[PDB]
Amino acid sequence: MLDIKLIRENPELVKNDLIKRGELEKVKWVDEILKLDTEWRTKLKEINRLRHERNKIAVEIGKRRKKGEPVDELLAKSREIVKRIGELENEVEELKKKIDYYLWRLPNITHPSVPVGKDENDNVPIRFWGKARVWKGHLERFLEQSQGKMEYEILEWKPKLHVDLLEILGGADFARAAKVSGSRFYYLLNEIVILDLALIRFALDRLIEKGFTPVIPPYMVRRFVEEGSTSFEDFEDVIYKVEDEDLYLIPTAEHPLAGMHANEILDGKDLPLLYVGVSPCFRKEAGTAGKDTKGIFRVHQFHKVEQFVYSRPEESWEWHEKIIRNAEELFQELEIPYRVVNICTGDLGYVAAKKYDIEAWMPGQGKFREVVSASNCTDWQARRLNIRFRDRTDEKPRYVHTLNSTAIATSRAIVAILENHQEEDGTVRIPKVLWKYTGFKEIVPVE
Amino acid sequence: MLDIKLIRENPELVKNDLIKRGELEKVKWVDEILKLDTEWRTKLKEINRLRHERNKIAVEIGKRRKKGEPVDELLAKSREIVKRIGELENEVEELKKKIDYYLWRLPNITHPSVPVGKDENDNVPIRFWGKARVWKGHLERFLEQSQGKMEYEILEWKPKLHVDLLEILGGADFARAAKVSGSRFYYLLNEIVILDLALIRFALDRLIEKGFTPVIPPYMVRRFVEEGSTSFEDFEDVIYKVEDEDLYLIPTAEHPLAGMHANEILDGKDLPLLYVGVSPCFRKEAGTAGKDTKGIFRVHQFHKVEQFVYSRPEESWEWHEKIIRNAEELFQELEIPYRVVNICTGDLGYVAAKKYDIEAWMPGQGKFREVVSASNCTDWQARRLNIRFRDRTDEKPRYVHTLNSTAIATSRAIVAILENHQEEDGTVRIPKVLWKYTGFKEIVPVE
Ligand SMILES: Nc1ncnc2c1ncn2[C@@H]1O[C@H](COP(=O)(O)O)[C@@H](O)[C@H]1O
Ligand SMILES: Nc1ncnc2c1ncn2[C@@H]1O[C@H](COP(=O)(O)O)[C@@H](O)[C@H]1O
């Protein structure tokens, strides 16, 4: 939700951001908002004018009681004032609802540091890490996407796609999943199940060492926490609702974590509040029904360890920068070459002010694919969930800033490990850092 | 689902099992199904008779063609025949629908060793284990449920309830979960989160060592897998259905595990199929909205590692014994005193033929509570999901038996650990077998 103040004190700033975002059909809203806001104030100033009248008409009927008191009229003038006052109050009431309806439907104001663009093609790579293994046949695409700034090694043989690897590795059964649940669902098997759990613990241990409190939240939440966490467009495209209940399957632990302190006033002496949640994630993925990679890259359910941060507005950006690096550290230990990208205005989303994504190099796919995302939501969720804080128990509480970032979403971490650590025969070596969690050091094909 | 052949050949047998189950109403169904089945079987005969009669009349009306051909009579007949075949055919389909309606709502035939009883009160203790710590104020109930066949020791202090321990230990937030999702939801925090994952991993390893193939299934399934794993009653009381989708949140890994091989003819050579699934579980828990224990003992979501077995009928009973013991073994290492009860007809349920439960002694509560349950479903699920096997491609395929059993449901295992391992000051000592998974050897209080 956007702060009506910000709109009153800079409609042009919002209209232009609305354009950098591509939300052109919504700039007209800026005006609509202000003219309503204006009307709201006018009716309010009339109510005061009227309350004051109520008073004068009052002292009068009295001042006339000690006189001829023909106050029969003033009594009628009084009855209409309360009538008007009510009408106005109700009118003001509705006027606020229309204002808020637009406010809840407006994307966060982007930071000046986010590049301007149309879509994912415009995101801007700002950093690379690792020695990518590239197939002779992807050499150009790689060099273009890496801008030549990344260390690589050419591969003789053609690296396989993760879906095929899971197969030769006996790690999954897609067909039976389709019979039981439908498309984009799956059964994970053997070593892959241990690897999944292992990735959760690894992620979990590290954020804990960095001081984040580990939480397992509710996987189903009430509607207000979903609408307080993202744009309403998500109820159609991504969020599953359960019949006959005010319960929605969470698409990320981010949401229940942000709901965890809805309607509170935190004590500044506690910030930053650091949470690291684990939870299955459920997504309709309606926009597609089958795009390309047909394994566990884009599915209906996946596990994800999430970093969530409550901070003072003055600390958010520094935190945005810390969490993204927390995620980067994991993949480096996991030995996954990648590139972090600054998402542009057109691919940014409604909730974020700025967003960094980690796109891992996928040897088999011949490309970089998103594997984690860190967003600074500033006060957007806060204003919605009413999450404020105060330092001195006598001052006006201010909204806090919220931030979230993937630590590890097992689904993709697994495709990245399978595609980046595969050997010609299909054998997949497990990054040394996970050995303490898996037991085995590699997964060999079955026969 | 019960076999129509069983009802025909042995109606008395099923009536008696029903009476023994005290399903006094359904007993009438046996005769009803029989009555409809005979009509159904007759009309089927009628239809074949008529079809053959129609042909003999088709060749004959054409025979009179080369003769006087006063076929204007046979013609009228051939029309009565097709009219009858049509009428019959519909009566048949209707008959099948009424018959299946009953076949699908009939409980499984209990094994003669299942004791008769009205509810869980009549459930029978068949074995005990461990040394229980008992509060003096709970001595009667303890001896009552222990039959005085279990070693123990009296505590002069009152051991606390897990809900309280969770609070003094800083491992959960219930108030916020209620804000965010409603009651019987929760946020697990700090070392309780690690303990939760550590229990899943511990169960997985032990079951893997025993050769079960580990699996992570779909958390949402199509209605048929649900209708194939339990009685329809469950749709009202337990299973959450997702809006506008033929998808249902699973109440246990057992269901998709059973659905995994629906409509297949396994190769006898592969039997037994041993699966150990992990997954979150969702239950409506309709019969309640408030009962007694207010922690994580009876909630809407919890994690659970489940044992599932696809078996040859002649091996199912030996397996029912091996899996309950696998669970016992886990709780013994976890050092939780307990008793295992053979479940009676009234607390048995629709899909099991026989069932054992492991009830953990709960120091704070002063009683034994169900922590794991194991069943042999024989061919009940198999008949519904159409799961068969054959040893030779020649032979007619026959139904397999299925069995399921808890390994560890983290929720109740955590209450058992908290209550049986607390100390006077409130800290809880984690059993040694888990150290390799939790790191920490115990959880101490906070301010
Ligand atoms: N449909 C999906 N299937 C598997 N993983 C996903 C899916 N959607 C998102 N993810 C993972 O969750 C991360 C964060 O997603 P978001 O919650 O969309 O920022 C993505 O970078 C992926 O690692
Ligand atoms: N609503 C619940 N909340 C927490 N744990 C449960 C719940 N229902 C069942 N359990 C656990 O799951 C085990 C097996 O239950 P069942 O699937 O009903 O055979 C029980 O013995 C408990 O340990």
From Swiss-Prot, chains A, B:
Pathway: Aminoacyl-tRNA biosynthesis; selenocysteinyl-tRNA(Sec) biosynthesis; L-seryl-tRNA(Sec) from L-serine and tRNA(Sec): step 1/1. GO terms for molecular function: ATP binding; serine-tRNA ligase activity. Gene3D superfamilies: Bira Bifunctional Protein, Domain 2 (3.30.930.10), Serine-tRNA synthetase, tRNA binding domain (1.10.287.40). It holds the Pfam family tRNA-synt_2b. ATP binds at residues 283-285, 299, 370-373. Its main location: cytoplasm. InterPro entries: aa-tRNA-synt_IIb (IPR002314), aa-tRNA-synth_II (IPR006195), aa-tRNA-synth_II/BPL/LPL (IPR045864), Ser-tRNA-ligase_type_1 (IPR002317), Ser-tRNA-synth_1_N (IPR015866), SerRS_1_N_sf (IPR042103), SerRS_core (IPR033729), tRNA-bd_arm (IPR010978). Transmembrane segments: none annotated. Keywords: Aminoacyl-tRNA synthetase, ATP-binding, Cytoplasm, Ligase, Nucleotide-binding, Protein biosynthesis. One of its GO terms (cellular component) is cytoplasm. The keyword Phosphoprotein does not apply. The keyword Glycoprotein does not apply. Its EC number is 6.1.1.11. It catalyses: tRNA(Ser) + L-serine + ATP = L-seryl-tRNA(Ser) + AMP + diphosphate + H(+); tRNA(Sec) + L-serine + ATP = L-seryl-tRNA(Sec) + AMP + diphosphate + H(+). Consists of two distinct domains, a catalytic core and a N-terminal extension that is involved in tRNA binding. Catalyzes the attachment of serine to tRNA(Ser). Is also able to aminoacylate tRNA(Sec) with serine, to form the misacylated tRNA L-seryl-tRNA(Sec), which will be further converted into selenocysteinyl-tRNA(Sec). Belongs to the class-II aminoacyl-tRNA synthetase family. Type-1 seryl-tRNA synthetase subfamily. This is Serine--tRNA ligase.
